[PDB]
Amino acid sequence: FDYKEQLPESAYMHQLLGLNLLFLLSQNRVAEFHTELERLPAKDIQTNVYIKHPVSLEQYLMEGSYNKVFLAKGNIPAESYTFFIDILLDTIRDEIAGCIEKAYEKILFTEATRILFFNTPKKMTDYAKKRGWVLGPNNYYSFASQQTTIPSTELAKQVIEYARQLEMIV
Amino acid sequence: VIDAFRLINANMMVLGHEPRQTTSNLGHLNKPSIQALIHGLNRHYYSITINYRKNELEQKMLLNLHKKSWMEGLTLQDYSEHCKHNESVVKEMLELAKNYNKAVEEEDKMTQDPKRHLEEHVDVLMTSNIVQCLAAMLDTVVFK
């Protein structure tokens, strides 16, 4: 992006650039992701494939079409886009979790396996052996939902503050 | 209203002498009263100053007269009466605010009581409300 006038156009550039975008998505750095997209020129977002694919993955992931995100696995412009697809699957699982523990009531074992695209059923225990949302009640996958006293001290602080700014001379 | 007096010798103001000499600027800081002048505050008797003498213990014992108890310090105000007072003061303040709008418009067009009354009323409302609210929180914490 810097020595633009002097540097000759490098056709062997978009590959690494989009691979960087994929890396940002992989480590859930959405802010930096969109900053670099903005840095990129406008046309490349819709013309090139190397960049379009990471753009497509991020767009799908923000919409919530995780099924499309997964189905995109086979669709990869160049094999270089590797190991970040894997870190991206891991991060997607983490985000699916985030959803589950922020806003659900309880997910049974079969439905947890269905929703979270875990590893083989035997390792399906994964992410409960790792995150462990206080699981266990009734069925081991009860999800243990992770969902009134006057704050007298704080109210006293604030009211005293009113009095202080009203009585001080200024 | 207490005044101390002493007489003037008959051979003092008639022999050509002032009733009482003056060596310090102290004796002219208090003015006499016409009531006494008429009866002769300076023809037959003086007027000695008073200058009350108060220790440090008498003043405390007298302060005990109106000294407010910790109960009065920490006791809330009847909430019904407090709400009635809030309502009455806010209504009177509304009336003063209408008058204040009229006054500011009129003065800005052609070239105060509303402003001063509004200021005193805002003072009373804020002091009352803050005091009662803080007392309420203090009690909610102290008595549980």
- What chain B residue is nearest to A149 in terms of C-alpha separation? B140
- A19 within 8 A of A13, measured Cβ to Cβ: no
* Interface touch B130/A159, C-beta < 8 Å: yes
Around Cβ B96, how many Cβ atoms within 10 Å?
A: 21
**Distance separating alpha carbons of residues A105 and A146, to the nearest angstrom:** 8
Contacts of A149 in chain B (CB under 8 A): none
* Interface touch A153/B141, C-beta < 8 Å: yes
Q: Is the dihedral of CA A156, A161, A162, A167 positive or negative?
A: positive
**Alpha-carbon dihedral of residues A9, A11, A12, A14, nearest 10 degrees?**
90
Q: Which burial class, exposed, middle or buried, applies to B64 when counting CB atoms under 10 A from its CB (0-12, 13-18, 19+)?
A: exposed
**Distance separating alpha carbons of residues B123 and A55, to the nearest angstrom:** 61
- B73 within 8 A of B35, measured Cβ to Cβ: no
- Chain A positions contacting chain B at CB under 8 Å are 150, 152-153, 155-156, 159-160, 162-163, 166
Domain ranges of chain A: 1-165
CA-nearest of B4, B14, B97 to B46 is B4
- A116 within 8 A of A97, measured Cβ to Cβ: yes
Method: cryo-EM
- What chain A residue is nearest to B123 in terms of C-alpha separation? A166
Q: What is the DSSP letter of B45?
A: B
Residue A135 DSSP SS3: coil
Angle (CA) A29-A35-A38 rounded to 5° is 140
Phi and psi at residue B96, to the nearest 5°: -65, -30
CA distance A84 to chain B (A): 56
Of B130, B137, B141, nearest to A163 by CB-CB distance is B130
Q: What is the DSSP letter of B76?
A: P
Around Cβ A104, how many Cβ atoms within 10 Å?
A: 15
**What six digits make up the tokens of A16?**
């690494």
Going by C-beta distance under 8 Å and a sequence separation of 6 or more, which residues neighbour residue B141?
A152, A153, A156
Contacts of B130 in chain A (CB under 8 A): 159, 162-163, 166
**What six digits make up the tokens of A114?**
């269905």
Q: Where are the beta strands (DSSP E) in B12-82?
A: none
- A51 within 8 A of A35, measured Cβ to Cβ: no
CA-nearest of A66, A2, A76, A59 to A25 is A59
- B133 within 8 A of A159, measured Cβ to Cβ: yes
**Distance separating alpha carbons of residues A14 and A63, to the nearest angstrom:** 25
- What chain B residue is nearest to A154 in terms of C-alpha separation? B137
* Interface touch A163/B137, C-beta < 8 Å: no
Q: What is the DSSP letter of A151?
A: -
Residue B7 DSSP SS3: strand
| Site of tokens 């914490």 | B141
CA distance A170 to chain B (A): 16
How far does CA A90 lie from the centroid of its chain?
10
Q: Is the dihedral of CA A75, A79, A81, A84 positive or negative?
A: positive
Q: What is the DSSP letter of A74?
A: S
CA distances from B19 to B14, B30, B134 (A): 10, 17, 63
**What six digits make up the tokens of A100?**
């589950």
Contacts of A156 in chain B (CB under 8 A): 134, 137-138, 141
